[PDB]
């Protein structure tokens, strides 16, 4: 099946559901993440940690500083304009994550549509 992809409106719905089995994987650099991010997302920088989603759990936490996401969850990948999100999705899907998705529009899309002004 085609990788599941989400529009802004789809993402707004997903954020508002607070689904415990969904992980929002923002692969921008930490400096980009600090400017603005979706609440409750995680930051797993692609540029500085391109192999992150290939690491075992112990090494993931040493390198990234947060726990390795549970592979049973749906991981939704994005960056700023989408390229890095797409690359990171490929790493994860090739390393044991069977439920992965894209937010192609990424944080540029989120901010363009005013997502940063939501409180969902
Ligand atoms: Cl998790």
From Swiss-Prot:
EC numbers, comma separated: 2.8.1.-
InterPro entries: Rhodanese-like_dom (IPR001763), Rhodanese-like_dom_sf (IPR036873)
Domain Rhodanese, residue spans: 18-119
Keywords on record: Mitochondrion, Phosphoprotein, Transferase
SMART domains: RHOD
A GO cellular component entry from the record: endoplasmic reticulum
Phenotype when changing residue 79 to A/S: Leads to the loss of catalytic activity
Modified residues (Phosphoserine): 7
Activity modulation: GSS(-) is a potent inhibitor of RDL1, since the presence of the sulfur dioxygenase strongly increases the RDL1 catalytic activity.
Superkingdom of origin: Eukaryota
Localization per Swiss-Prot or TrEMBL: Mitochondrion
Residues at the catalytic site: 79 (cysteine persulfide intermediate)
Gene3D superfamilies membership: Rhodanese-like domain (3.40.250.10)
Ranges in coiled-coil conformation: none
Purpose: Thiosulfate:glutathione sulfurtransferase (TST) required to produce S-sulfanylglutathione (GSS(-)), a central intermediate in hydrogen sulfide metabolism. Provides the link between the first step in H(2)S metabolism performed by the sulfide:quinone oxidoreductase (SQOR) which catalyzes the conversion of H(2)S to thiosulfate, and the sulfur dioxygenase (SDO) which uses GSS(-) as substrate. The thermodynamic coupling of the irreversible SDO and reversible TST reactions provides a model for the physiologically relevant reaction with thiosulfate as the sulfane donor.
PANTHER family: THIOSULFATE SULFURTRANSFERASE RDL2, MITOCHONDRIAL-RELATED, THIOSULFATE SULFURTRANSFERASE_RHODANESE-LIKE DOMAIN-CONTAINING PROTEIN 3
Miscellaneous note of the record: Present with 7470 molecules/cell in log phase SD medium.
Name of this protein: Thiosulfate:glutathione sulfurtransferase
Species per Swiss-Prot/TrEMBL record: Saccharomyces cerevisiae (strain ATCC 204508 / S288c) (Baker's yeast)
Name of the gene this protein is made from: RDL1
